[PDB]
Write an enzyme that holds these catalytic residues in place. Structure first.
Site, PDB file in Angstrom:
ATOM      1  N   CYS A 248       5.845  -1.717  -5.096  1.00  0.00           N
ATOM      2  CA  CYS A 248       4.554  -1.744  -4.787  1.00  0.00           C
ATOM      3  C   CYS A 248       3.601  -2.291  -6.089  1.00  0.00           C
ATOM      4  CB  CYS A 248       4.127  -0.299  -4.420  1.00  0.00           C
ATOM      5  SG  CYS A 248       2.336  -0.229  -3.905  1.00  0.00           S
TER       6      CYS A 248
ATOM      7  N   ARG B 249      -0.145   0.100  -6.958  1.00  0.00           N
ATOM      8  CA  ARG B 249       0.129   1.401  -7.608  1.00  0.00           C
ATOM      9  C   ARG B 249      -0.925   1.789  -8.794  1.00  0.00           C
ATOM     10  NH1 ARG B 249       5.928   1.659  -9.781  1.00  0.00           N
ATOM     11  NH2 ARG B 249       5.973  -0.498  -9.700  1.00  0.00           N
TER      12      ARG B 249
ATOM     13  N   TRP C  17      -4.910  -0.963   1.657  1.00  0.00           N
ATOM     14  CA  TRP C  17      -5.225  -1.963   1.948  1.00  0.00           C
ATOM     15  C   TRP C  17      -4.712  -3.118   1.789  1.00  0.00           C
ATOM     16  CZ3 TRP C  17      -8.186   1.504  -1.475  1.00  0.00           C
ATOM     17  CH2 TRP C  17      -8.095   0.847  -2.633  1.00  0.00           C
TER      18      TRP C  17
ATOM     19  N   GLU D  94       0.063 -10.993   2.114  1.00  0.00           N
ATOM     20  CA  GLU D  94       0.798 -10.269   3.089  1.00  0.00           C
ATOM     21  C   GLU D  94       0.647 -10.760   4.547  1.00  0.00           C
ATOM     22  OE1 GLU D  94       1.408  -5.800   2.124  1.00  0.00           O
ATOM     23  OE2 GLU D  94      -0.643  -6.249   1.415  1.00  0.00           O
TER      24      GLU D  94
HETATM   25  C1  HEM Z   1      -3.978   0.454  -1.670  1.00  0.00           C
HETATM   26  C2  HEM Z   1      -3.578  -0.809  -1.846  1.00  0.00           C
HETATM   27  C3  HEM Z   1      -2.278  -1.353  -1.584  1.00  0.00           C
HETATM   28  C4  HEM Z   1      -1.770  -2.404  -1.991  1.00  0.00           C
HETATM   29  C5  HEM Z   1      -2.596  -3.646  -2.119  1.00  0.00           C
HETATM   30  C6  HEM Z   1      -0.021  -2.689  -1.763  1.00  0.00           C
HETATM   31  C7  HEM Z   1       0.473  -3.688  -2.026  1.00  0.00           C
HETATM   32  C8  HEM Z   1       1.684  -3.741  -1.661  1.00  0.00           C
HETATM   33  C9  HEM Z   1       2.416  -4.963  -1.302  1.00  0.00           C
HETATM   34  C10 HEM Z   1       1.751  -6.255  -1.435  1.00  0.00           C
HETATM   35  C11 HEM Z   1       3.636  -4.495  -1.088  1.00  0.00           C
HETATM   36  C12 HEM Z   1       4.850  -5.752  -0.758  1.00  0.00           C
HETATM   37  C13 HEM Z   1       5.224  -5.464   0.809  1.00  0.00           C
HETATM   38  C14 HEM Z   1       5.523  -6.546   1.395  1.00  0.00           C
HETATM   39  O1  HEM Z   1       5.704  -7.719   0.833  1.00  0.00           O
HETATM   40  O2  HEM Z   1       5.731  -6.614   2.611  1.00  0.00           O
HETATM   41  C15 HEM Z   1       3.791  -3.227  -1.080  1.00  0.00           C
HETATM   42  C16 HEM Z   1       5.149  -2.540  -0.996  1.00  0.00           C
HETATM   43  C17 HEM Z   1       5.012  -1.015  -0.878  1.00  0.00           C
HETATM   44  N1  HEM Z   1       4.058  -0.140  -1.056  1.00  0.00           N
HETATM   45 FE1  HEM Z   1       2.188  -0.622  -1.610  1.00  0.00          FE
HETATM   46  N2  HEM Z   1       0.067  -1.175  -1.604  1.00  0.00           N
HETATM   47  C18 HEM Z   1      -0.754  -0.460  -1.538  1.00  0.00           C
HETATM   48  C19 HEM Z   1      -0.841   0.964  -1.327  1.00  0.00           C
HETATM   49  C20 HEM Z   1       0.286   1.708  -1.080  1.00  0.00           C
HETATM   50  C21 HEM Z   1       0.195   3.106  -0.646  1.00  0.00           C
HETATM   51  C22 HEM Z   1      -1.166   3.999  -0.495  1.00  0.00           C
HETATM   52  C23 HEM Z   1       1.546   3.553  -0.467  1.00  0.00           C
HETATM   53  C24 HEM Z   1       2.086   5.074  -0.101  1.00  0.00           C
HETATM   54  C25 HEM Z   1       1.534   6.122  -0.448  1.00  0.00           C
HETATM   55  C26 HEM Z   1       2.416   2.235  -0.821  1.00  0.00           C
HETATM   56  C27 HEM Z   1       3.936   2.265  -0.883  1.00  0.00           C
HETATM   57  C28 HEM Z   1       4.415   1.208  -0.870  1.00  0.00           C
HETATM   58  C29 HEM Z   1       5.839   1.361  -0.867  1.00  0.00           C
HETATM   59  C30 HEM Z   1       6.697   2.408  -0.841  1.00  0.00           C
HETATM   60  C31 HEM Z   1       6.201  -0.546  -0.749  1.00  0.00           C
HETATM   61  C32 HEM Z   1       7.891  -0.828  -0.840  1.00  0.00           C
HETATM   62  C33 HEM Z   1       8.930  -0.206   0.106  1.00  0.00           C
HETATM   63  C34 HEM Z   1       9.990  -0.678  -0.447  1.00  0.00           C
HETATM   64  O3  HEM Z   1      10.725  -1.411   0.169  1.00  0.00           O
HETATM   65  O4  HEM Z   1      10.713   0.113  -1.392  1.00  0.00           O
HETATM   66  N3  HEM Z   1       1.577   1.309  -0.962  1.00  0.00           N
HETATM   67  N4  HEM Z   1       2.599  -2.707  -1.667  1.00  0.00           N
HETATM   68  C1  LIG Z   2       0.598   0.907   2.359  1.00  0.00           C
HETATM   69  C2  LIG Z   2       0.770  -0.333   2.328  1.00  0.00           C
HETATM   70  C3  LIG Z   2      -0.500  -1.356   1.848  1.00  0.00           C
HETATM   71  C4  LIG Z   2      -0.178  -2.632   1.910  1.00  0.00           C
HETATM   72  N1  LIG Z   2      -1.043  -3.686   1.609  1.00  0.00           N
HETATM   73  N2  LIG Z   2       1.190  -3.223   1.997  1.00  0.00           N
HETATM   74  C5  LIG Z   2       2.215  -2.375   2.414  1.00  0.00           C
HETATM   75  C6  LIG Z   2       3.527  -2.904   2.502  1.00  0.00           C
HETATM   76  C7  LIG Z   2       4.515  -1.959   2.758  1.00  0.00           C
HETATM   77  C8  LIG Z   2       5.924  -2.642   3.164  1.00  0.00           C
HETATM   78  C9  LIG Z   2       6.098  -3.267   4.204  1.00  0.00           C
HETATM   79  C10 LIG Z   2       7.600  -3.861   4.572  1.00  0.00           C
HETATM   80  C11 LIG Z   2       8.454  -3.446   3.609  1.00  0.00           C
HETATM   81  C12 LIG Z   2      10.006  -3.904   4.056  1.00  0.00           C
HETATM   82  N3  LIG Z   2       9.981  -5.279   4.292  1.00  0.00           N
HETATM   83  C13 LIG Z   2       8.329  -2.416   2.687  1.00  0.00           C
HETATM   84  C14 LIG Z   2       7.249  -2.024   2.353  1.00  0.00           C
HETATM   85  C15 LIG Z   2       4.521  -0.581   2.516  1.00  0.00           C
HETATM   86  C16 LIG Z   2       2.913  -0.025   2.524  1.00  0.00           C
HETATM   87  C17 LIG Z   2       2.025  -0.913   2.430  1.00  0.00           C
END
Ligand code: HEM
Ligand SMILES: Cc1cc(N)nc2cc(-c3ccc(CN)cc3)ccc12
Ligand code: HEM
Ligand SMILES: Cc1cc(N)nc2cc(-c3ccc(CN)cc3)ccc12
Ligand SMILES: C[C@H](O)[C@H](O)[C@H]1CNc2nc(N)[nH]c(=O)c2N1
Ligand SMILES: C[C@H](O)[C@H](O)[C@H]1CNc2nc(N)[nH]c(=O)c2N1
Ligand SMILES: [Zn+2]
Lengths: 411, 409
Positions: free
Chosen positions: B108, B111, B280, B285
């Site tokens: 992520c 974070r 958000w 994405e």
């Molecule tokens: C607040 C703004 C946030 C932004 C801008 C953000 C951004 C991102 C992005 C760009 C990805 C890559 C996902 C993809 O390419 O499909 C990601 C993955 C992820 N996000 Fe964040 N995120 C945010 C908030 C959060 C929150 C609130 C949570 C959980 C409480 C979270 C948990 C995760 C997890 C667990 C993954 C990857 C899961 C995995 O494959 O291991 N995110 N995030």
């Molecule tokens: C909370 C949040 C915000 C964001 N902008 N992207 C996320 C993207 C994911 C995400 C989406 C897909 C996968 C597996 N391809 C793993 C994580 C999870 C959470 C997100």
């Protein structure tokens, strides 16, 4: 054990068994992945098992495993090791070794071409002047008036580590970099330290933004000597843009031949510390990294200014927009001058075909995702969605310390 | 064994000690790196050390390690596990656990916001109708009329695997995908099977390009139920370009709220199989992946056409040129409508700072380079030149099988 990789764009699943033949270590463990870490005097004791493994591979590839020719060669190498403490590769073995070192290079996206490598045997070389001559001939052959040809020149192997052959340049052709008193840099910031060594060794620097560096060549452990590559051998390309007529006025150019000269070639335990190799450029190497890295020429600003972009907020993606234009210009310029180049779409597409072919005929293809995916437009190239397994096979190209950090100066 | 990571653009070197806390495994060995692999019923036995490890980090974090309160809580959980074969988290532990699961999410990039997470305790929920209610409240709170707020809603923990709570959707809000008799695909191709399961379970599909999918909610292990999210809760952004007027003619929009609903939250050995969380979007994405993946909306060719680019040879970089304009539009649209969004430059810069912070106050930050580097313009973002160490800390978010492959229907 068998292992699977999936392409998530196409759902093609491939099966890797080749990783079993892997000996060296990756740096990773069960508890940590060091996948993005840039970098994570050999005795007769450990050398014959390395030699044997190589010769077993070599004679397998020529379909003579267990033959009398194979067994005699093993005998011959063994005797040479206990008696002379090292051994010499036959020509056939050297060529095979160099090709497979490239084939095994998990960070190289250009490996579809691996079997088409011109190997130049420079193991009879003894002096820096001889090194200069061999390298001049490499450059002429490889450049071929713009129609680039892959080549490698192999200088004598290490013996006791006190008589190394080294090319002190990181690449055969690179531009100088000068730190100015006001903190600014003229030329290529990447080459400032090397430029300074050259200058100290007696090089008279033109002090321009695109000065070709001299060769600094070390034979048999002696102090390195300076040589100037004949300018007629150094093919260069003026960078212009197909729609933007002001782009030429930025005064950019680049050289045609990428020829990396600071790596070490390992074959059957033998170490070749001087082994310059060359191919041709993927456009992004120049247009994304060389020109737009913050720590290099970094021309994003000036290009964005001349395009009159909204450079106030980054969310205007002015940086992204300039980057594409600069890479368009690099490809346009090289093609217009008929100098071999490949775009990142073509190159990644080729690599996927290569990789699949390798899984079928070889049982795998070690690959480093972090390096294989291009530095722009990653997910619209097909390697982005491709799972890859990274492991180390021999023969190999390895990193080695910069020689100025380890060299014992004669005076 | 106290590892170093270098930034090659700045020469900043950080020293990682936090990795030595790591428990779970990466999928790699010394002989092979699996860093680019997408995806590599607990007894009384495994549970208590897991609970102990968690309570230990919890009481340290509030500076009460080795206190009566600590030891008492330890003994209290100890007795409850011996007795009930499981245990319940205190509210404070639940909030801590959820925030740290995000903190530990090595993939992520967002974070830096990790400690500003709104945690909704839904452990008293018993039905899909109740799940729907909790989820509507989440969506409204998270959306906040375009001023997005991070939130997680946590449903009852797994017990015996037969009484699982599950959200069958991969995200709370996603567009339908229909395969045509013609051959291609209308709507979102990634959602084609789910869009079918919904219809196969009773949904009536409007068969548009941007049909918000119904929720399929499973409570206590029962057959899942369809629910329609109230349209006034679904904030959407019409996609237009700040310089190209023909852009609106494409008829594109996306939703404001990314809310992932198919992962599993693990805290102190306990398994929360239904825990939808939302933040958000980062602009890429939607604009890079959602719009331009070949197995998605795949609108690249159509866009280049309208830009009159030379699509005859790849070396014209028409795809790259279009890709940038599309992403400029997404950002422009969200910003115009005052809906929270972040571009990949500010987000990656934020992440480097977060890394800095974590190395200083925590001793490290698990990070997965393959996922942290954005899908466009990689090397002109600062994370590209940042070495990262990837390892698994708990509490964590984990993948779990799709329910329809599991549910005894
Ligand atoms: C607040 C703004 C946030 C932004 C801008 C953000 C951004 C991102 C992005 C760009 C990805 C890559 C996902 C993809 O390419 O499909 C990601 C993955 C992820 N996000 Fe964040 N995120 C945010 C908030 C959060 C929150 C609130 C949570 C959980 C409480 C979270 C948990 C995760 C997890 C667990 C993954 C990857 C899961 C995995 O494959 O291991 N995110 N995030
Ligand atoms: C909370 C949040 C915000 C964001 N902008 N992207 C996320 C993207 C994911 C995400 C989406 C897909 C996968 C597996 N391809 C793993 C994580 C999870 C959470 C997100
Ligand atoms: C023929 C066309 C070739 C192309 C288009 C190509 C392309 C590339 C690119 C883009 C990289 C990444 C380097 C960077 O980003 O700075 C790379 C790495 C590499 N290339 Fe190739 N290459 C070619 C030929 C060759 C040849 C002929 C050899 C050796 C005989 C070779 C050996 C390597 C090695 C060993 C690496 C890895 C360097 C490392 O581990 O750091 N390549 N290549
Ligand atoms: C033979 C060849 C061709 C090419 N187009 N690029 C290369 C790039 C490299 C290379 C260049 C730089 C680095 C470290 N920055 C690592 C490998 C080596 C050989 C190459
Ligand atoms: C095969 C490869 O691991 C896969 O395409 C990954 C690569 N990197 C990614 N990075 C992000 N942020 N999101 C993704 O979905 C992916 N997909
Ligand atoms: C830290 C990170 O591994 C480093 O910046 C790498 C990333 N991937 C790369 N990929 C290529 N092709 N070339 C590079 O120089 C790098 N640099
Ligand atoms: Zn690894």
């Amino acid at each position: 054990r068998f292992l699977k990789v999936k392409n998530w764009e196409t759902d093609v699943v491939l099966t890797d068994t080749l990783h079993l033949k892997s000996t060296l270590e990756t740096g990773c463990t069960e508890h940590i992945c060091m996948g993005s870490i840039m970098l994570p005097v050999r005795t007769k004791d450990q050398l014959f098992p390395l030699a044997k493994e190589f010769l077993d591979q070599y004679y397998s590839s020529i379909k003579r495993f267990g033959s009398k020719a194979h067994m005699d060669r093993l005998e011959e190498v063994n005797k040479e090791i206990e008696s002379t403490s090292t051994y010499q590769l036959k020509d056939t073995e050297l060529i095979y070794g160099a090709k497979h070192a490239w084939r095994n290079a998990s960070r190289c996206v250009g490996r579809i071409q691996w079997s088409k490598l011109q190997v130049f045997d420079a193991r009879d070389c003894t002096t820096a002047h001889g090194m200069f001559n061999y390298i001049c001939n490499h450059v002429k052959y490889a450049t071929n008036k713009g129609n680039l040809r892959s080549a490698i020149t192999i200088f004598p192997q290490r013996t006791d580590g006190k008589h190394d052959f080294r090319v002190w340049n990181s690449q055969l052709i690179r531009y100088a970099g000068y730190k100015q008193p006001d903190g600014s840099t003229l030329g290529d910031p990447a080459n400032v330290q090397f430029t300074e060594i050259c200058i100290q060794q007696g090089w008279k620097a033109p002090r321009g933004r695109f000065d070709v560096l001299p060769l600094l060549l070390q034979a048999n452990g002696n102090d390195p000597e300076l040589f100037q590559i004949p300018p007629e051998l150094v093919l260069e390309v003026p960078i212009r843009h197909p729609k933007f007529d002001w782009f030429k006025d930025l005064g950019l150019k680049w050289y045609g031949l990428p020829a990396v000269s600071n790596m070490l070639l390992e074959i059957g335990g033998l170490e070749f510390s001087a082994c310059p190799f060359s191919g041709w450029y993927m456009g992004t190497e120049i247009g994304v990294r060389d020109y737009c890295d913050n720590s290099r020429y970094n021309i994003l600003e000036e290009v964005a200014k001349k395009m009159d972009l909204d450079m106030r907020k980054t969310s205007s993606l002015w940086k992204d927009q300039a980057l594409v234009e600069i890479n368009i210009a690099v490809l346009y310029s090289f093609q217009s001058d008929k100098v071999t180049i490949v775009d990142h779409h073509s190159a990644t597409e080729s690599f996927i075909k290569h990789m699949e072919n390798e899984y079928r005929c070889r049982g795998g293809c070690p690959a480093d995702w972090v390096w294989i995916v291009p530095p722009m437009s990653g997910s619209i190239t097909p390697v982005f969605h491709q799972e890859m397994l990274n492991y180390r096979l021999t023969p190999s190209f390895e990193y080695q310390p910069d020689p100025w950090n380890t060299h014992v100066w004669k005076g």
